[PDB]
Amino acid sequence: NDEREYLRHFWHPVCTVTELEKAHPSSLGPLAVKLLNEQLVVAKLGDEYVAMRDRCAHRSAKLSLGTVSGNRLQCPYHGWQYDTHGACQLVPACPNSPIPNKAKVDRFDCEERYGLIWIRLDSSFDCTEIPYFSAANDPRLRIVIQEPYWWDATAERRWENFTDFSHFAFIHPGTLFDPNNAEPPIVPMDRFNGQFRFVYDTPEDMAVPNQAPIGSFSYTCSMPFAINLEVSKYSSSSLHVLFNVSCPVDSHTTKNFLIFAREQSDDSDYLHIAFNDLVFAEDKPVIESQWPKDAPADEVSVVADKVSIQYRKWLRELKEAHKEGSQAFRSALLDPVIESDRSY
Amino acid sequence: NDEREYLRHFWHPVCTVTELEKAHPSSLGPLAVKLLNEQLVVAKLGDEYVAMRDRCAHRSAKLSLGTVSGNRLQCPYHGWQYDTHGACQLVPACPNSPIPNKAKVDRFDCEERYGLIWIRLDSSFDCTEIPYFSAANDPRLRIVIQEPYWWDATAERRWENFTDFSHFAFIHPGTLFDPNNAEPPIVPMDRFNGQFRFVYDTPEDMAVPNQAPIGSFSYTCSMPFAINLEVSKYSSSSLHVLFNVSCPVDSHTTKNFLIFAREQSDDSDYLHIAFNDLVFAEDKPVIESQWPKDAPADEVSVVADKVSIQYRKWLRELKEAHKEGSQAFRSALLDPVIESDRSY
Amino acid sequence: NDEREYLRHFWHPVCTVTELEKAHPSSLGPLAVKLLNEQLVVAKLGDEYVAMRDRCAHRSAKLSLGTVSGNRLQCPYHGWQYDTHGACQLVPACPNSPIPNKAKVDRFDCEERYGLIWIRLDSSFDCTEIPYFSAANDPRLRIVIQEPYWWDATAERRWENFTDFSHFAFIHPGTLFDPNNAEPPIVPMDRFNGQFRFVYDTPEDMAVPNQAPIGSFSYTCSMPFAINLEVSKYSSSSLHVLFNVSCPVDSHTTKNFLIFAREQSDDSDYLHIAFNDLVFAEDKPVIESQWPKDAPADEVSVVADKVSIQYRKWLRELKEAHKEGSQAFRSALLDPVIESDRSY
Amino acid sequence: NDEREYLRHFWHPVCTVTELEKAHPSSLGPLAVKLLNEQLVVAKLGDEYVAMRDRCAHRSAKLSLGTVSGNRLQCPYHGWQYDTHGACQLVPACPNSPIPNKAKVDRFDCEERYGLIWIRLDSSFDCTEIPYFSAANDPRLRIVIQEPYWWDATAERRWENFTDFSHFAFIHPGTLFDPNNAEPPIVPMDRFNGQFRFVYDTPEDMAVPNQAPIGSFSYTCSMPFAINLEVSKYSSSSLHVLFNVSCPVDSHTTKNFLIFAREQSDDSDYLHIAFNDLVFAEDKPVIESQWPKDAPADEVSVVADKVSIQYRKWLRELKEAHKEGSQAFRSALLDPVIESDRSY
Amino acid sequence: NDEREYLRHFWHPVCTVTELEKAHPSSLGPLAVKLLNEQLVVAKLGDEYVAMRDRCAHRSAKLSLGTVSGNRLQCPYHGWQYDTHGACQLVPACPNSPIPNKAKVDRFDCEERYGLIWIRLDSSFDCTEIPYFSAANDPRLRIVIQEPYWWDATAERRWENFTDFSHFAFIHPGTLFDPNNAEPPIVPMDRFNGQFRFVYDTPEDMAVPNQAPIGSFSYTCSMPFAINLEVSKYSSSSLHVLFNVSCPVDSHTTKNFLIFAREQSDDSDYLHIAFNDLVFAEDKPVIESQWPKDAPADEVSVVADKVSIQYRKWLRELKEAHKEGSQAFRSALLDPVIESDRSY
């Protein structure tokens, strides 16, 4: 848990709002989720999304097997009722007696945004924010939230797969790139407000389907695991946005979320969903094969790996700064480092 | 067989638009569907939804395994291309030769309405229309189209299940009615424009969930299988509309569609979907147990069965009038028969 | 397993007699069983039930894959024949050679009582007895031995679930308690002859099925894992006895046994079996959810938890006394500690 | 772990040539295989069978999901191509740049012999050879390579099962021996050229099928896991050879190979395959039951266990000599030790 | 059964010799097979392959559940023994009494050829022969018998699929033909000795794999269901032969056999097997979709359908001639009808 501890300071998606509403017939939850190997429960208490450890203080039953009752989450075993702060406010067996001081469960940051539920396990450094999705509140764009997809691969390896262009000719030859353009350009990369920003111009006139988001690629990557990709498409001259983020469920699993938005929206959502699913099915077996799950020091990079080289370097900086404490981590995350000629 | 020929003259839903778009990665279809034991294929050819028999004129392959190409449907076997009228316009093996006169497949009236695809197999009487859904184009109402649900029961038995309230205390005691209000009123029923119209007032103060659409019930039933139920709810003083229609797939199977609309729409869609699904799960085993599948003459009615009795009577009249021809059928369907004091 | 070693000194049930007879077509076993993570084999050799380690001394094959031949258990691999004392008496490959003195397997106390097979792994303290079942040899009572039921929960958590008053309202609302009677009395508890003894008069006039054993509850709990509950039922004024005992199979699993006896026995055994199975089905998901599997020090008790508080206290004293040896253990188990006004 | 390092110095079979050719539609591989817990990939690169670690040096994808291209193995992820020495010779993303010095993967000695693929993980002692199969290149004999069979048992326990006849009466009574000849002779055993050699004469006139290879048995066992058994059958006066060898896949699993050759070969191959499969099915549950998987020091031998005893002794000597280095190991393996009157 | 009766006069394959030898551990059978909806049993009695109705004369048990005992097939129920002529020669219950005259089962023509077992149900016209396989006894060629493949399609539709070239561009675009050459040539077709003979020159320089049998195509089709295709390949300048034959199992199923032979045989059998299997997997869903299973009179042909038009015409002639009797059928089958300029 040691090398991963710094990840607890970020906001991570754990489920869609849809999944929470479908979990229990009340539409309020509770829903069991797992984040960085922590077993948590999510529920809607009044107007608030809450996240607690999925473990009752009394006899350790799972609260995720319980029931929302107005402004309370009720344990299924002996009916202890927890408020939005994780504090027990009713012990039905002793309704007069004072409630023990220890009758509380851990309560974590939990917020809805973009149709996903986000949890931050450690808020002590008070310097991380929910990742940036550029299409939110853009009335020009129709937004579709896909169903989550689970991979037997880590969030770091998934991020590197999503931002890697040298693999398109070998993994996506029918679908995203010609098999003949295996040589990608080396682009400037900027750190700004805790995001990696970089821009690409993919090759034109490739034998790829019209629904393929191929064009001018503008990445805004909220560290550590979210990618916002704005595509000015060549084929249609219209904006298409991909927002992909991985939930690090445990040491070898990710629950992954894709939200996409498009300016030309008279067509079928399922044209795009089927295409995204095909791309993911092409990536999945190769990424799941990578072993060990966490990239060892012995991996051999080439110059075309600039994006993942720079990604790994920043992650190591954040892990090092975490050991040094709050101010060092804030600096490592939010200090600007500009390579390009743009102004922010 | 013979008993069911008259049903070919009505419009029946065969799939949702969502089902069509999901069937094939192109989002255009084709999709195989079955209606009154006919194997059909639906596809979006240009701006039109087209229904054809699912059987190529060349060597009888299923066109539903083929592909939409431009505004035509291409057979998977030797690539014959069919236009919106079912006529073959390209024989790839014989590009110069004249296309055989009989190179064509049967085409059927096919329209989208309310997010469903409707097919009329026999248009020769030309007096039937797509059923009425009251909530379409009412901006006060949020509309949800559920996924279809399949039952091993006929469309007639499904219709009678949907409009019966005698069964609420026994099939839906927790969910729609109190167990001790089993006695229902007997209301006037009007025939108008091929619809059964009748109005109820279900019992008040019943211990049923708040998401239960219980209140004053106004039915508009487009013969033979569609029900439009407008509820002015007691618990929320808000309009809730249920539109239920059965596809008669064959002699013992229905593919059933529910669309629901609601005025108070700040809550979760899945609160309502979960409730509807629970109601359907309560009905399903009992309706599927009814045998023989078609109601025989030996069933014993009581006065509380008025809706069922009058429905069976009208269906019998429609079946007999169909044998007398187009004009007799038009009168049996569209002549008014008013029982209530309502103006028309 | 250092902290479970004291449990080896008690008698634990490992199967029903029916299970042993059904295991092999001979009706004599062998049957593989597991107790405290020890792999054992049970068989009927002549008139005796025998238990040995399930591991042949020769080449370590499982004797449970072998065959009973009258008064011998024969290994499946090279046919070594073990007698009722675990000693090899025939090496078929060397019929004239003397049998090595090492050719023996560990043999454990094994006795039938009440239709179960009991094993005691360590008889050195010579102060433990098979648990008490009050209905044995009471000719007024019809006895039913249920099939065993397996839970992913420990024997301690199962015992505490069975004797807990406060969960009935939340886990068993339809079946054992009204949801309104959540506040239990705090009763005197006596230690006598290695049993916990306590009485509880459950609430009257509860909307609960008539086959529910609800009434005046008299518990005789043979430590560590057996519960004998005599119910003088309110609804029928007749005696109903529940005898529940958990086999600690390993650190996270129990094989549980229920025997029940009843004075009014003209009804169906399966009326009561189905009721017991419904109660167990209501408990099972919540008990299996408790984590960690062993109750840790951080659990928060309230005054209504008296029974489980006192149970945990006695188990801890037995564990500590086992470290101090035979006499200290005998005193911790068998010394009386009287809280009530009763005489024994 | 440490206990098994000496086994890396021997040649072990990992697949049949048939398995390699079936793995990929090209018939060239690649095929993933596992040997002593190492994940390897085998492919036919030009005229050579090559074994590499199944892990690309770039980003650790499995080369076994890749493709043979010319005389190289191409990774599925970014198309790096590895030559027969494990060196990367093409980085498609950086065609002009120099290939990193560390762009290479470990390669292992790999040869085809007898229709199997053999791998030696550690070649530094350079004193081991591929096991001896007597029937290779004997045109009097028809050879059949069976499909591999997997057992949840170690290669040591499998070897001892194959060379034991004490068990025939109990495991194979219908098939290999009479049940009442359980007493076997004790024969001289010779060590010569890294092989155990010993000769038997099984009992005559036994009620076993004609396809049973029962007769005069001559064993040549190439240490540690290969057995060559030449049978001069009693029933047919014809030579029958069984070659059995176990791949030690990991600490508890074997992938086992049987090749059999016969002089009288006008009958069906499947008469013999069915018989061998029946024998293996009789052994399998008993051998898989042996626990712990590795034989501990507490097993009790009898004089009939001579073959097993001498096998364990030699393995112990090889393990100890390996710790002393290459010369000590060569002597322990290849020094002769003659017990019989046979000339060498 | 009426329109299919003429097919009983031909020899049909029912299993491979391998399948017969694998069916029972004796390697002699019996094996149940089904041909033209007849339930038959195949067994090897001495040197003879025999086929009988799979139904004992005594109490109608299946002989396929029985045992070969030298020159007899023994029923499993009461052990009646049938000789190679289907006559019972032993009634174990009455070993002295005369055997009833009716104690016989129907016996059918049954012969091995090319590694397949062939059955002819009706030999009364004495004019049909086992189909021609050109590669048999050609020492230049290596022969591989594939495992049978089952399709939900009739033998007529399978034959037409195999000899159809207009479908390659749509069903086999990667594998057998360019998608751009959809236009096939019209070739002369000869009837000779009950075979259709015709020759094709497929297009050259197509983007197809090297193991694809593409070249000069010489067909010899033994009516009604066997195709012998000799390919003088363009890519390798070497002979490749495909022998495909369908067993008409019942009215909607075929059990299909592929044997292939090749002159250049230093490569892997599985290169070719995998390619054939890919081709079959491409055909299978489209052919299984064709409905009704038997081609109706309403199918619309084009000039490129010459082969199947001529096939259907000959089949109709054979069906008509069958009604007229033995001499008419012999003439329809064996009279020559020459279109080309070759001499036979």
Ligand SMILES: Cn1c(=O)c2[nH]cnc2n(C)c1=O
């Ligand atoms: C990584 N990735 C994707 O996963 C994807 N899915 C659909 N377009 C996509 N694009 C353009 C992309 O770059």
Ligand SMILES: Cn1c(=O)c2[nH]cnc2n(C)c1=O
């Ligand atoms: C038949 N029926 C239903 O199936 C249903 N489902 C949800 N409300 C429902 N109501 C009010 C109803 O009358």
Ligand SMILES: Cn1c(=O)c2[nH]cnc2n(C)c1=O
């Ligand atoms: C724990 N428990 C049970 O498990 C049970 N099962 C049936 N009656 C029961 N009673 C009264 C009970 O207390």
Ligand SMILES: Cn1c(=O)c2[nH]cnc2n(C)c1=O
């Ligand atoms: C161990 N073993 C076998 O596994 C076997 N299988 C077939 N004959 C066999 N024989 C003679 C044999 O000794």
Ligand SMILES: Cn1c(=O)c2[nH]cnc2n(C)c1=O
């Ligand atoms: C029909 N057919 C096949 O099924 C086939 N399979 C492999 N080559 C093939 N060829 C050349 C072919 O014509």
Ligand code: FES
């Ligand atoms: S375990 Fe939650 S209330 Fe007791």
Ligand code: FES
């Ligand atoms: S079957 Fe449709 S094109 Fe031939």
Ligand code: FES
């Ligand atoms: S392992 Fe039991 S007799 Fe050998």
Ligand code: FES
């Ligand atoms: S992981 Fe193999 S080429 Fe990149």
Ligand code: FES
């Ligand atoms: S049924 Fe065959 S012998 Fe009696």
Ligand SMILES: [Co+2]
């Ligand atoms: Co990718």
Ligand SMILES: [Co+2]
């Ligand atoms: Co209902």
Ligand SMILES: [Co+2]
């Ligand atoms: Co309970």
Ligand SMILES: [Co+2]
């Ligand atoms: Co054996």
Ligand SMILES: [Co+2]
């Ligand atoms: Co084909």
